[PDB]
Design a protein around this ligand. Structure first.
Ligand SMILES: *[C@@H]1O[C@H](CO)[C@@H](O)[C@H](O)[C@H]1NC(C)=O
Ligand SMILES: [Cl-]
Ligand code: NA
Lengths: 4, 251, 30
């Protein structure tokens, strides 16, 4: 999902 | 960065590290676009599903770095943030559309051999360069595999055709994103990964020999998986917003 | 303004170790  | 290599000294002098004050840790990458403005991904600052919502006082930026961890007294500059600006239509609830944020520093940073801004593309540079099969470059201090590097990593990756990007994922992609990475049939590897988020995807223009930031590391599903691609915020398409913010709040 | 021109590379007429891969993709990538 998001890079994070 | 997966399947990259150590950057050379001063190779990416616009690279910025977004750093949490407490506990002290790397949060994200970012880029220097002028002496007082830094560009990053909105999701580095605001992502409610993970209870993330940083305020200016929670963060620092570190500019001119090479080592991931060492304090580089000689060369790095540590700056405080005056204000964070997140795109108002950043769609965190669905697909990370418009994954972009600006940070204004509390004082201008002095440029040096290690600290220097990247250009933002004009319309024709974007049209000409952001085409499938042309390569850009991603840098960061993120994970080496889906495991942290000693120094800044670099990898070059080709831009991918939109239908291939679209068919690779169930996330609803938009024209404010592009994807990059090798296809399985190209027999090469490489990707950004966690911790590289917010940092720059750059291209060297053959028209004027300058480096332009075309993308921001935004999202992906794992890192360096076969048939998956990294996704990047499309900087040119969001440049109208960048210009509005800087015009209103001061270069 | 002076953006995008690196002190230790373009400003010294020095190339980094992999930038030619980017330039060559303009020839061969499409
Ligand atoms: C984030 O935190 C700020 C306070 O620092 C709050 O005003 C704002 O509503 C929060 N944003 C979201 C979307 O949760
Ligand atoms: Cl194959
Ligand atoms: Na892949």
């Amino acid at each position: 999902x998001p890079x994070x | 960065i997966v399947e990259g290599s150590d950057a050379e000294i001063g190779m990416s002098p616009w690279q910025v590290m977004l750093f949490r004050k407490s506990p002290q840790e790397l949060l994200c990458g970012a880029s220097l676009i002028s002496d007082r403005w830094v560009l990053t991904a909105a999701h580095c600052l605001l992502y409610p599903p993970w209870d993330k919502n940083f305020t200016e006082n929670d963060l620092l930026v570190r500019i001119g770095k090479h080592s991931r961890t060492r304090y580089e007294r000689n060369i790095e500059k540590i700056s405080m943030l005056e204000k964070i600006y997140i795109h108002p239509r950043y769609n965190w609830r669905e697909n990370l559309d418009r994954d972009i944020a600006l940070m204004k520093l509390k004082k201008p940073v002095a440029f040096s051999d290690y600290i220097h801004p990247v250009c933002l593309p004009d319309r024709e540079t974007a049209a000409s360069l952001l085409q499938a099969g042309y390569k850009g470059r991603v840098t960061g201090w993120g994970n080496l595999k889906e495991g942290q590097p000693s120094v800044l990593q670099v990898v070059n990756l080709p831009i991918v055709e939109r239908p291939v990007c679209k068919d690779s994922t169930r996330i609803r992609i938009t024209d404010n994103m592009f994807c990059a990475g090798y296809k399985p049939d190209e027999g090469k590897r490489g990707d950004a990964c966690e911790g590289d988020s917010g940092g720059p995807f750059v291209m060297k223009s053959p028209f004027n020999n300058r480096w332009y930031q075309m993308g921001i590391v935004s999202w992906g599903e794992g890192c360096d998986r076969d048939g998956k691609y990294g996704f990047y915020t499309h900087v040119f398409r969001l440049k109208k917003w960048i210009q509005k913010v800087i015009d209103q709040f001061g270069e | 303004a002076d953006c995008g021109l690196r002190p230790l590379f373009e400003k010294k007429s020095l190339e980094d170790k992999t930038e030619r891969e980017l330039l060559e993709s303009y020839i061969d990538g499409r």
